[PDB]
Write a protein that binds this ligand. Sequence first.
Ligand SMILES: [Zn+2]
Ligand SMILES: [Zn+2]
Ligand SMILES: [Zn+2]
Ligand SMILES: [Zn+2]
Ligand SMILES: [Zn+2]
Ligand SMILES: [Zn+2]
Ligand SMILES: [Zn+2]
Ligand SMILES: [Zn+2]
Lengths: 268, 268, 268, 268
Amino acid sequence: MPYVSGKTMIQQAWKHGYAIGAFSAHNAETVRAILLAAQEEQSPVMIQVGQKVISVMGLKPMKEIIDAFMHDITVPVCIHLDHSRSFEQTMQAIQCGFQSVMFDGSHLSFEENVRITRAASEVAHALNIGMEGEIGKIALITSCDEALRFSEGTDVDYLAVSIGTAHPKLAFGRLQEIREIVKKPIVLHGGSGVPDDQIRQAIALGVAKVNVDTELRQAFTQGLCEVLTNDPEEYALAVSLGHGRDVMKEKVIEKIRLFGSNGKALQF
Amino acid sequence: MPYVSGKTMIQQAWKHGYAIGAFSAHNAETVRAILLAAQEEQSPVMIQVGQKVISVMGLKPMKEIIDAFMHDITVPVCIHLDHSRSFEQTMQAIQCGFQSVMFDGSHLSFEENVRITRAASEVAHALNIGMEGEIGKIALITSCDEALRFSEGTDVDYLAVSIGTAHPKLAFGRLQEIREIVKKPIVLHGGSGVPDDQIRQAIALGVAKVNVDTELRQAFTQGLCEVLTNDPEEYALAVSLGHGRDVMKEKVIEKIRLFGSNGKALQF
Amino acid sequence: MPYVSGKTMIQQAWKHGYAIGAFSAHNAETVRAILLAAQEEQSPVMIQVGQKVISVMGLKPMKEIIDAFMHDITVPVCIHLDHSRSFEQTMQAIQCGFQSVMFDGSHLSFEENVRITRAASEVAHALNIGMEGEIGKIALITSCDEALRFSEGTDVDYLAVSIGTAHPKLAFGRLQEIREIVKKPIVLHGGSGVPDDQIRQAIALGVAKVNVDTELRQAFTQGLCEVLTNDPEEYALAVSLGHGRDVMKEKVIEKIRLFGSNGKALQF
Amino acid sequence: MPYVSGKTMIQQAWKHGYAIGAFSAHNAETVRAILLAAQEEQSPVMIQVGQKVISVMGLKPMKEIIDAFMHDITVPVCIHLDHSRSFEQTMQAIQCGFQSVMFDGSHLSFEENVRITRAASEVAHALNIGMEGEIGKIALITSCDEALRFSEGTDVDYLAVSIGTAHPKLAFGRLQEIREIVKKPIVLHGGSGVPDDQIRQAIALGVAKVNVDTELRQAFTQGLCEVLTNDPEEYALAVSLGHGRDVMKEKVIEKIRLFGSNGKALQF
Ligand SMILES: [Zn+2]
Ligand SMILES: [Zn+2]
Ligand SMILES: [Zn+2]
Ligand SMILES: [Zn+2]
Ligand SMILES: [Zn+2]
Ligand SMILES: [Zn+2]
Ligand SMILES: [Zn+2]
Ligand SMILES: [Zn+2]
């Protein structure tokens, strides 16, 4: 489609000093809210399929729902598997044509995280798919050495580290050091619990992908409640879930602007 | 898939004295609620794509969302275009592989209703797709003569007439007369405003397709409100929209049982 | 894909004084020969699926084989159903996403040709698909009056008439008169039995689609024989059928140049 | 589709004392010849996409051509990647939905053959895809020890060894020893240069997949020559390539019967 590899998309954002919003989708309205936001803002975007939606809707059905809503979309879109803890699941996402995957081995030993992430990375790189991995430790902030050893052992395109969020004060100095030593884009997890000003500075220092989930569901739910609070007998899902969608679309737009990706679709 | 022609499905229900529920879907959760209901009840089912959802989600995207959720479904499923007033729209549904279409020309003159419905019917019949049409009048209840003239001029497989509902007391005698003279299955519109006992008798007299929309959206919305009434800070769409889905699934099950299609999937 | 409506493609050729070659395909190598020819020449092209290949390979399988070979093709391509004599078959081609269809009712009465062609034309026009029809008579050359009456009654986009070929001296004056009175592009059938100079003049006078079948199969067969004449123990289909493909590709290139469509892909 | 995993298909043949023919396809007619042969014989079958056809037609286009001809096929079919020497190519076959792959590392050191084959095997096994590997040596016949070490290090489902053919007298004793020690199905390569009686005995001793390529192309070419020898002006590809197809279909039938898979589709 106008689907683009996550490797290409993130590296471009990192090179040009902005980030890609990685927006978690959970159903039809939420997928559409993200895509319409991106199209209006002329922004590249990632749509994340994470573990919660996979347990509810299925991985391959969500992929197919995204495909269904791409009919009128011309901006760069990358479908990303979020926080996989299974080599098998990661392979399923690769097989149904995702453009980016994350194997999160941060719960494993350093050696095993590296070994499985690396094995997934070799498959992704064979098929032009972006690869994300994550490390915590090998005091609670990842060291340059740990980040470099992880990056080199796995060949991930982009990496998440322990930088001061939780799944909050960002370790800006550390992030700066990581850009110079590791020389790869950084992914922020748990960024919704951090102020906007801090987000902007993290991106200036090398964060090129920012995960957004709860904040979108909060905006969606707030739209729903507002309609149904006013009128509990409003039975048109077009109106109730529709307003949720509009309020979530506005949130996505707000994030796109924060991240600096508005207007960047021309660059691809 | 286990997709089946609407002509086959409705004629079978009519022959065997039960009806097919034609359940209007509006998004991912609502499609899934219908399919899971049908699978659990071992019931043939129609999923309707009507004018409201087409204005919100699009016709072809809804078709593709239904396809996405068929992965584990083995019961007979027929996707039906509801209340089209456009020859063009009806042709679009045929092109993307619907198994039943309705052209509603009941707002047109008798001659023009017949002419357009007939033209759509010739396309549907060329491709093994079920065809529905509707007549009101040519006192507020359709005459046998009108129903026969419409049926013969259009060659519809199943037809809706003015039988005592509104889009309420059913014209049972008239329906009986229509079975003997017209000798085709009847479709009920506006049946949610009619008691269960009346529905059961209409089916005994030849109603073989019963449209259900508002009652499902009411059940969905009631699930949503219940979760969000309890806890407005419940931001998991899996929980809020999920409970809506479960409450809607139960409604579909209730309708399947009313219509008598539970257990009938073996018959196909 | 870079699939384009036949209505668009033919009208453009007619407006600009060139024709589209409508090249009949019969299998994998022959489809590819046409597409590679068109890509090299930067030419719009029609690929025809006609009655012979439908009896051998099937209509929907040929469509899917064309789709398989479009992966690296960027020039305008239109898949056309050739010489259908069945409303049902024409509807099947529409359903699987052809971009042009021909219903040939020239074996029927004038009134019935018009009635069926018109019915197919209404479906095609509903879905942005090009429509071709054919008339002979209502002395062996079609009159302006007959062509105009047929064109007006059917609303075909392009039409074949009896102009001096057989399925040979072209009726150039008649063709000129037809351009001024009917004001639609003309399709030539049986053009392989006519010299190049005559083809060029027919195109100058309004022929905008030229059917090519036998000449391609002759070129293919000549490639095959040449390899197998030299070496009957050449068992590599890559070599034998491959050389057939190369010799057929050259023939297609030759036709593209005759028709004047080389270089015209920029115009779309 | 009625596509079945190669792991399932080969293990079943091995368990029941017959083999699966793995028939190399090169284009539309040759795919169809194999499928029609299998359907008529009520036989499970593998269709191989090997290195020659990949260089001519492409890997993904051949997959899509096979899919196009499955419309009326109900017997078990497995699409297999033959003699890949590239991890990347093997991953491409996995991604487009092959049901069996072979990584041939027999040109590499033992350690590197094992390492790459194993890595491909982990991906295949994650997605329920059959895995083949090959070993020669670590005098020209593979030892039990070598076969066991290779089998254990890679976890292939089925394996090719050096058993007395060339890419000829079969090493029956060795094959017997391999069944008892390795306890996996064996794949024969280069079996066309071996008599039928020898093939039957190899299958009795554990050969459960027999590759067939040249013999089919020889049968196809012989059909072609026969038509074109008689009549060089026979330009109907339906007749010339058609007769090739019929003569190749008969060859496939002959192989199915040799291998003992005729009638075995019921067993699945
Ligand atoms: Zn995270
Ligand atoms: Zn994380
Ligand atoms: Zn209605
Ligand atoms: Zn109605
Ligand atoms: Zn012709
Ligand atoms: Zn003709
Ligand atoms: Zn081999
Ligand atoms: Zn080999």
